[PDB]
Design a protein around this ligand. Structure first.
Ligand SMILES: CN(CCO)c1ccc2cc(/C=C(\C#N)c3ccc(C#N)cc3)sc2c1
Ligand SMILES: [Mg+2]
Ligand SMILES: [Mg+2]
Lengths: 212, 223
RNA sequence: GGUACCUACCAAUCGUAGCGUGUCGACCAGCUGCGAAACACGCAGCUGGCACUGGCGCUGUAGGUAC
C-alpha cells in the first residue's frame, strides 16, 4: 500500500464533559484530503469531518478537525453520552485509500460489582452427549474481571469459552459469559460445579455453585 | 431520500466467486464515484475498491487487486463488486459507499450502505441447537432471577434472538458469538426478570438462523 | 548616382548574411477555477520549457532587375 494512516490512541475511557483528542499520522504528505467518521456498534459509519477541518452538514459543533503538516487531529470538546463510538480517519489523497486503525471511545463510570449466576446443562444437551455450564456476570464496570471454574475442586483450564457484550447504552455497564463444555460421562463423574469471580467491585471473590 | 441498499452476501468456499450488488436511490450513480469498503469482524475499516464517474476508471486495494472487479449499471442505478478466488481473509461486512460532491464534503464518504456479510469458509451451513438456561433454583439473587437460551453449533453467522417474540426487551443481553473448537459458532442470550413473577410469567426465546433457514422457539421454566 | 525591389551571402548557434526580438497561436510538463468531475474528457486562467510557427525591428555586402 501507498500511504499509511497510523491512528492513536487505540481506545480510551472518558467521562462525560471530558475533551478527547485522536490523532492520525500519514506516512507521507496527503495535503488536506483527510476525513473523519464515527461508527456505532452494528451500524454503518457516518461522515463527521472532511477536508481535514471542514464540518459535515448536520454534525454538531463539538467535533473539530485540525491539521499540522502530516498530522491530523479530531477533537471532541466536552464529550457527551451519545458520542461513545469508534472513530476512524481516512486519507483520500491518492489511491489506494487508507483508513486508520480506529479509536474506541467508551464512557467511564463508577465501578459496579457483577451479578454472578450459574446455569447447569439442560437434559436435552446431556442426552445429546454434551453438557454446557454457563457462568453469567451481569452489569459490571470496569470491563476487567476474572472467572475460574472448579468441579470438585480441580481448577479447570482449557475448556471454557468467554464472551462479553458491548457497553450498555443505558447504564454503561458490561456483561460477560463463561461456558464450560464437558462430555456426558465427564459431567456425570463429578458432583459440585462452581464459578469463582474476582472483580474490583468485590472485596472478596464470589463463588456460585450447584450439585449435579 | 438518498439510500444505498446492498445485497448478495452469504457463505462461499475458498477459491469460490460471488457478486455483491448495491442499489442506489435518491441520486444517479453516474454523477458520483462509488466505493466498496469492508470491515472484518471486530476489525477496522478496510478500503476495497472504487469506480470514478464519467471516465469509469477503477481503483483497487492491494489485498484484492487482480481478484475483485467493480462495475456499474446506470440503467439499474446499481454498483456491483465481483469477487473471485476468495480467501479466508475476505470474510467481512462489505459496505457500499457514495463519495460526496466535490464542492460539498470533498472526497468524504457521505451516505453508506447498511452492510452485507460475506463468509469464506469450507465449513457447511448448520442450524443451531437451542437449549434452555433455567432460572437458578437456589435463592434468586434479590428478587431478580436470571434465565436464558444457549444457541450452539451453528454456521455461518448471523443468528437473531428475541424474547417473548419481542414483548421482552428489558435487561436482555445477547452475547457475541464465539468460534468453538469444532469450528461452529455458539452464544447465549440471557435475561434478568422479577423472581416473584417468574412462575406466573412465561418466557420463550426465539432463535432465527436464516442461512440454514431454521427457526426455534424454546421455553425455559424453573425446573 | 538615388530610390524600390529580386537572388545569394561557410559551419556551429532557434532563426538570420548579421544583430535584436520568444509570439494571435501550435507543442511538452506542472499548477489552479469550473463542468454532478481525484484519473480521463471538456471550457477558462497561470507558471516553466520549446522554438512547430521562421514573423517583426534594425543594419548590411555582392550580383541583378526596374523607374
Ligand atoms: C531574444 N531571443 C533569444 C532568447 O533566447 C530570441 C530568439 C529567437 C526569437 C524568435 C522569435 C520569433 C517570433 C516572436 N516573437 C515569431 C513571431 C511570429 C511568428 C509567426 N507567424 C513566428 C515567430 S522572437 C525571439 C527572441
Ligand atoms: Mg549558416
Ligand atoms: Mg521551423
Amino acid at each position: 500500500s501507498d500511504i499509511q494512516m497510523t491512528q492513536s490512541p487505540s481506545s480510551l475511557s472518558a467521562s462525560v464533559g471530558d475533551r478527547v483528542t485522536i490523532t492520525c499520522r500519514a506516512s507521507q504528505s496527503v495535503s488536506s484530503a483527510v476525513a473523519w467518521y464515527q461508527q456505532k456498534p452494528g451500524k454503518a459509519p457516518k461522515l463527521l469531518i472532511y477536508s481535514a477541518s471542514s464540518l459535515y452538514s448536520g454534525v454538531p459543533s463539538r467535533f473539530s478537525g485540525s491539521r499540522s503538516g502530516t498530522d491530523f487531529t479530531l477533537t471532541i470538546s466536552s464529550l457527551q453520552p451519545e458520542d461513545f463510538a469508534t472513530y476512524y480517519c481516512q486519507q483520500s489523497y491518492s489511491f489506494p485509500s487508507t483508513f486508520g486503525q480506529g479509536t474506541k471511545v467508551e464512557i467511564k463510570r463508577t465501578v459496579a460489582a457483577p451479578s454472578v449466576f450459574i446455569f447447569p446443562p439442560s437434559d436435552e444437551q446431556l442426552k445429546s452427549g454434551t453438557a454446557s455450564v454457563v457462568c453469567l456476570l451481569n452489569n459490571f464496570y470496569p470491563r476487567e474481571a476474572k472467572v475460574q471454574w472448579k468441579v470438585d475442586n480441580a481448577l479447570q483450564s482449557g475448556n471454557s469459552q468467554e464472551s462479553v457484550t458491548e457497553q450498555d447504552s443505558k447504564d454503561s455497564t458490561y456483561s460477560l459469559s463463561s461456558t464450560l463444555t464437558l462430555s456426558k460421562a465427564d459431567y456425570e463423574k463429578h458432583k459440585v460445579y462452581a464459578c469463582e469471580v474476582t472483580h474490583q467491585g468485590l472485596s472478596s471473590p464470589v463463588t456460585k455453585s450447584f450439585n449435579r | 431520500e438518498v439510500q444505498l441498499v446492498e445485497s448478495g452476501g452469504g457463505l462461499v468456499q475458498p477459491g469460490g466467486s460471488l457478486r455483491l450488488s448495491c442499489a442506489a436511490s435518491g441520486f444517479y450513480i453516474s454523477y458520483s464515484s462509488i466505493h466498496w469498503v469492508r470491515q472484518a469482524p471486530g476489525k477496522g475499516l478496510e478500503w476495497v475498491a472504487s469506480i470514478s464517474p464519467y471516465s469509469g476508471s477503477t481503483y483497487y486495494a492491494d489485498s484484492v487487486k487482480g481478484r475483485f472487479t467493480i462495475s456499474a449499471d446506470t440503467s439499474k442505478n446499481t454498483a456491483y463488486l465481483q469477487m473471485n478466488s476468495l480467501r479466508a481473509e475476505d470474510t467481512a461486512v462489505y459496505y457500499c459507499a457514495r463519495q460526496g460532491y466535490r464542492r460539498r464534503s470533498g472526497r468524504g464518504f457521505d451516505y453508506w450502505g447498511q452492510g452485507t456479510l460475506v463468509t469464506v469458509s469450507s465449513a457447511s451451513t448448520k442450524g443451531p441447537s437451542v437449549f434452555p438456561l433455567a432460572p437458578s433454583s437456589k435463592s434468586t439473587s434479590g428478587g431478580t432471577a436470571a434465565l436464558g437460551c444457549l444457541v450452539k453449533d451453528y454456521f455461518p453467522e448471523p443468528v437473531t434472538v428475541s424474547w417473548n417474540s419481542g414483548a421482552l426487551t428489558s435487561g436482555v443481553h445477547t452475547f457475541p458469538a464465539v468460534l468453538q473448537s469444532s469450528g461452529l459458532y455458539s452464544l447465549s442470550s440471557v435475561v434478568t426478570v422479577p423472581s416473584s413473577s417468574l412462575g406466573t410469567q412465561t418466557y420463550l426465546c426465539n432463535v432465527n438462523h436464516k442461512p440454514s433457514n431454521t427457526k426455534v422457539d424454546k421455553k425455559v421454566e424453573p425446573k
